[PDB]
Design a protein around this nucleic acid. Structure first.
Lengths: 152, 97, 202, 80, 60, 105, 104, 127
RNA sequence: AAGUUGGGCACUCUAAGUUGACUGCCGGUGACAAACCGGAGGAAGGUGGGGAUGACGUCAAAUCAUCAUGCCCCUUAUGAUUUGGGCUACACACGUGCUACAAUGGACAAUACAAAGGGCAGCGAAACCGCGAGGUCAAGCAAAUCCCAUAAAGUUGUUCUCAGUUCGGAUUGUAGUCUGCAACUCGACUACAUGAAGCUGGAAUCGCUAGUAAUCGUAGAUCAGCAUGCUACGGUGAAUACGUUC
RNA sequence: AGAACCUUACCAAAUCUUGACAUCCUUUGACAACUCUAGAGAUAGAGCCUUCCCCUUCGGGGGACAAAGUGACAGGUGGUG
């Protein structure tokens, strides 16, 4: 009921390996077409190469990489007609978590290698080193919402 | 001995199972009582319209309620309920010996 | 709207069957013998105040129960026409044993009679709104609770068909407790067919 | 259409055995949609009724792989 | 049109491939049920009227 | 801007199939400046009274219906196109009130 | 005949006309080849033992000679199976409305 | 000592028992890692006896029936939860507040006619 | 050998006849005005989930081809009876679906877990004989047991290496398999061949709020034979609703 | 919710008009109730199971098959929702 009020948001189950809620939410977004096991195996083989190309354990590296993904301003369109109709609006903390996970996967699918064995882990170390393709569209949002700053 | 009790209604197959379990214990029987077999239903899905319309239809179903009665003390007083035909309305009895 | 008929909700829920037999093998052909003698009973009786029939079949002694709002007319003169019915009903099938008939009080509160006797008030072509009001006013006078009835097509003799219903009393068509009984007749007036529905309650 | 009994119309095989003995006649009005072509049919001419007008055709020796009904057209296509 | 086709059915055909089915009162052949031998129209009718034996309406 | 034409018990000619697109077609082509739609023309003869013409053009938001109960299937479309051209102007001036001077705070 | 190198032989003999997944079984029957034979296979003494089994087959190009004349025989008798070749008709009794594009 | 509980979820019944010993499960008389497919949801399956901390206490040896692997699992953690309240009956609030002991809350939804499958209406062209 | 057999274990499970969830029960400050908001109490909580049921009425809405009948028309035919065509035709144009355009895949080996429903000479096992579609008889049975029937996706291992390549398989000749008087118009598979478009799709547009979208296979009604449709079935299962201004 | 034939309503052929169907019916002529021949094939020509049950006493009526008949009638997925 999105006009009676708000929908009651539901609880998730954290990962057994990393003991993290954020890992399981990454499992569910890379779960293409309901296949839980065939996608979770790939994530469990896409942070070993993270822990191979950096000595730190990947549960530190994951929450360090997504901070170069998660933006702080975005654009919500208000129907003002002849105006710019693009208001720079800050991000709620729930959408702050989700939209970083979205960009991390959606540009992991457009790399040179075919296996998501290393399609995913390459973009994570790019996001760990504040570079790549999923970082550079955060700056594209931070050159679009931060250009039309006349609607704060 | 496996007296087969199957019928369309559920109020009738239950009251006719009470007949055969009563008219046997009065005789020298050791009746294993009525246990209910699972119902063998069947769904028929016709469409409602006279001429044209799918996407709006009425489903129909018919359910048979199956039970069985077995006795392992055959006396000539127990078979007086077997030879004695009662409640023939909407129940058939497949008497095996 | 598309009101479905009120019996169809309630067959087995709050009602019973107009045929209460069983046949696992050869279910098809001996189901046709029912509506053989549902046409055939409706042929030669020809509104002998017959509401509806029941069929029960058991060990080649197949029963037929008729209600007959005018009792004795199917019996005849001390068991005359009831024995004159089994002289043909036992030939259209094999046995047809133990043909009988029971009686009902309140001859025009069963809806099969209420639809039929005012549908036959339409071949004489006299005052269909009073033909309505004759059925409504007599209904709770005789002991009913809710009454509802209409006439659909070629209404009054004109060209454009118009439904015309009259109602009072509690007629809960959506409540599954209710013993709603409806009927539909086929009153011809030699300019088409008039259709007439009724709805009685208690 | 098994190996067991390659099908013949058999109301036509009786009418063709009188033809292949002596000098053949050059018409058999028939239907022949069901039957196959095997080498006891060569030379003879059949007026296969295509629904509209029975079309004459005579049997060659490369016709043995196919059956008799596959020749007279029923579409009347040419059109566009 | 209609009762010629009813008369065609009830005669024994030459072939078991023809094996043709209709209904006993419904003229249409095209929606038969070989346990009921009824068209979908009147099977909807006489089950609402209860002339058939035990058949619930719906809503399993 | 296709025309799925079909006549109830009337054989459609080809002189109608050019007279439609000049009036029903072209006078609404310059309306709806980003067009991709399908029209529908019914012609239903009634032997007792007359014919009738039904033209329905659905769009993104608001459809366009009109009916004439004339018997002349060339003069009736002179009134269908009149009712069609009125209904588009109702649709456009509904959405051409974007020009409202609203200055933000 | 004209097979390519640098791939496995279970897919390499497929590249000529007339072989699809029979080199997994039928060529593997006569010749004592394996599955992991790349360009580095030394198949020159094994070239002779596959030459004996491919000589029985019609595969390498010469099947398309007989396949071409089978259509030419079929149109010369002017059968319904043959007119559909010379006329863009789907031939094997298909619906020649909208979704019949690969014959045009 | 056999504390025998049952447990259901998603059209899959699961009856358990509790013999003392240590934590070791013998689902359909075989090992769990060779029966349950990928070992992730087993540590979520150990959640009910985690709050009573009876890890090295109870062997279970489930006989499960029907459903799928996430229907056989999530029904033995509900399976032993009915059996854990006859092992630690005062610890019912530890399982009521956290998960396991609720129910079989929901199964697959009925396919309505005049529709593709299970509330997903089919596509129509003309809006 | 699983006979799930001996006993019956009847205990659990399952299969069927019935007890229970309604703002009953508290606290809010909230004033009594019902609600709402937050708890606990049961397995369940706020019309629990879903179905059936569709008010007065709108559209001369759709069927005189399920039927039924006012009027009109036909009666060596506008009614009949047959095998032979056609309803399957095509330079095309829109609907609706199926399979895809892959290395969260493909090919081969192993190894699991369902539910629903059917079986009146019908389902037909285990054996064989065939590369296979399948043929020969008996084993059971008019069925909680016998059969259709080993669901599949999965999981485990070996592989190809990122190309229109081991991606898929359309289209054409070879098998004549099976059903049926008979598969040419005009079927259904599989067998070796052949391998085409197709590298995730523009403007636009549709479905969907949890066991739901998505996918995976299994059933049944029709039916001698024949679905990528329909109707039911379970398996696995996300994402997202700040908000009413457009 | 099953177009190879049938379905099938459509077309081309081959031949039928009390009609393949129903009803009064009259003589109830009382099965041409089965095979060969000729045939796209229905149909046509012969070989033919001349009857079937009761209950009188005489050979009728009831169910008896329809070869012929019309006072009649039938038949129309012909038309107009």
């Amino acid at each position: 009921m999105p006009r009676k009020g708000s929908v009651p948001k539901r609880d998730v189950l954290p990962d057994p390996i990393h003991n993290s809620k954020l890992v399981t939410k990454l499992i569910n977004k890379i779960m293409l077409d309901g296949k839980r096991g065939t996608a979770q195996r790939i994530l469990y083989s896409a942070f070993d190469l993270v822990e191979q190309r950096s000595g730190r354990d990947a549960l530190e590296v994951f929450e360090e990489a997504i901070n170069n993904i998660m933006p702080v301003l975005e654009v919500k369109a208000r129907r003002v007609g002849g105006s710019n109709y693009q208001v720079p609006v800050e991000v709620r903390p729930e959408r702050r978590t989700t939209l970083g996970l979205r960009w991390l996967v959606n540009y992991a699918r457009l790399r040179g290698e075919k296996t998501m064995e290393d399609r995913l882990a390459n973009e994570i170390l790019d996001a760990a080193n504040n570079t790549g393709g999923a970082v550079k569209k955060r700056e594209d949002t931070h050159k679009m919402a931060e250009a039309n700053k006349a609607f704060a | 001995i496996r007296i087969r009790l199957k019928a369309y209604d559920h109020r009738v197959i239950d009251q006719s199972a009470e007949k055969i379990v009563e008219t046997a214990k009065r005789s020298g029987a050791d009746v294993s009582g009525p246990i209910p077999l699972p119902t063998e239903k069947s769904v028929y899905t016709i469409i409602r319209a006279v001429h044209k319309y799918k996407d709006s239809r009425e489903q129909f179903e018919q359910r048979t309620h199956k039970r069985l009665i077995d006795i392992v003390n055959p006396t000539p007083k127990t078979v007086d309920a077997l030879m004695g035909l009662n409640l023939p309305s909407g129940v058939d009895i497949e008497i095996k010996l | 709207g598309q009101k479905i008929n009120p019996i169809g909700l309630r067959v087995g829920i709050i009602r019973d069957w107009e045929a209460k037999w069983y046949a696992e093998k050869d279910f098809a052909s001996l189901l046709h013998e029912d509506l053989k003698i549902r046409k055939f009973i409706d042929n030669e009786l020809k509104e002998a105040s017959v509401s509806h029939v029941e069929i029960e079949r058991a060990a080649n002694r197949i029963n037929i129960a008729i209600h007959t709002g005018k009792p004795g007319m199917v019996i005849g003169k001390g068991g005359s026409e009831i024995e004159k019915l089994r002289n043909k009903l036992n030939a259209l099938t094999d046995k047809k044993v133990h043909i009988n008939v029971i009686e009902i009080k309140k001859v025009d509160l069963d809806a099969r009679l209420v639809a039929e006797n005012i549908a036959r008030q339409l071949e004489n072509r006299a005052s269909f709104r009073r033909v309505q009001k004759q059925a409504i006013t007599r209904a709770m006078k005789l002991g009913a609770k809710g009454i509802k009835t209409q006439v659909s097509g070629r209404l009054g003799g004109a060209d454009i068909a118009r439904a015309e219903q009259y109602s009072e009393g509690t007629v809960p068509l959506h409540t599954l407790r209710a013993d709603i009984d409806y009927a539909h007749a086929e009153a011809d007036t030699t300019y088409g067919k008039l259709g007439v529905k009724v709805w009685i309650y208690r | 259409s098994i190996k067991k009994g390659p099908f013949v119309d058999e109301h036509l095989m009786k009418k063709v055995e009188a033809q292949e003995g002596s000098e053949k006649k050059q018409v058999i009005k028939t239907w022949s949609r069901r039957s196959t072509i095997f080498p006891n049919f060569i030379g003879h001419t059949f007026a296969v009724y295509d629904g509209r007008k029975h079309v004459p055709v005579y049997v060659t020796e490369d016709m043995v792989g196919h059956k008799l009904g596959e020749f007279a057209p029923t579409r009347t296509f040419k059109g566009h | 049109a209609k009762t010629s086709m009813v008369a065609k059915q009830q005669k024994k055909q030459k072939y078991a491939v023809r094996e043709y089915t209709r209904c006993e009162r419904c003229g249409r052949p095209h929606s038969v049920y070989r346990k009921f031998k009824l068209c979908r129209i009147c099977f909807r009718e006489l089950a609402y009227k209860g002339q058939i034996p035990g058949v619930r309406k719906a809503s399993w | 801007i296709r025309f799925e034409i079909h006549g109830d018990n009337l054989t459609i000619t080809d002189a109608i199939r050019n007279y439609i697109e000049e009036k029903i077609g072209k006078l609404e082509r310059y309306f709806n400046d980003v067009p991709n739609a399908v029209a529908h023309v019914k012609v239903k003869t009634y032997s007792n009274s007359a014919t009738k013409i039904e033209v329905t053009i659905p769009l993104k938001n608001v459809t366009l219906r009109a009916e004439e109960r004339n018997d002349d299937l060339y003069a009736g479309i002179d009134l269908i196109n009149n009712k069609l051209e009125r209904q588009v102007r109702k649709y456009k001036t509904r959405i051409n009130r974007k020009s409202r001077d609203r200055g933000d705070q | 005949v004209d097979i390519p190198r640098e791939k496995r032989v279970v897919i390499s003999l497929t590249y000529i006309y007339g072989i699809g997944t029979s080199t997994a079984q039928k060529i593997l029957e006569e010749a004592n080849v394996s599955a992991d034979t790349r360009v580095k296979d030394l198949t020159d003494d094994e070239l002779g033992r596959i030459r004996e089994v491919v000589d029985g087959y019609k595969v390498e190009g010469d099947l398309r000679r007989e396949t071409n004349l089978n259509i030419k025989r079929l149109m010369e008798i002017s059968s319904y199976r043959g007119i559909r070749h010379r006329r863009g008709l789907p031939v094997r009794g298909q619906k020649t409305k909208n979704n019949a594009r690969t014959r045009k | 000592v056999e504390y025998r509980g049952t447990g259901r979820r998603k059209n899959s019944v699961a009856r358990v028992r509790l013999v003392p010993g240590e934590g070791n499960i013998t689902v359909n008389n075989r090992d769990v890692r060779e029966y349950l497919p990928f070992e992730s949801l087993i540590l979520d399956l150990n959640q009910p006896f985690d709050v009573t901390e009876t890890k090295g206490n109870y062997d279970v040896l489930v006989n499960v029936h029907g459903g799928g692997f996430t229907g056989q699992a999530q029904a033995i953690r509900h399976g032993i939860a009915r059996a854990l309240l006859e092992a630690d009956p005062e610890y019912r609030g530890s399982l009521k507040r956290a998960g396991l002991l609720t129910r079989d809350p929901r199964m697959k939804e009925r396919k309505k006619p005049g529709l593709k499958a299970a509330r997903r209406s089919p596509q129509f062209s003309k809006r």
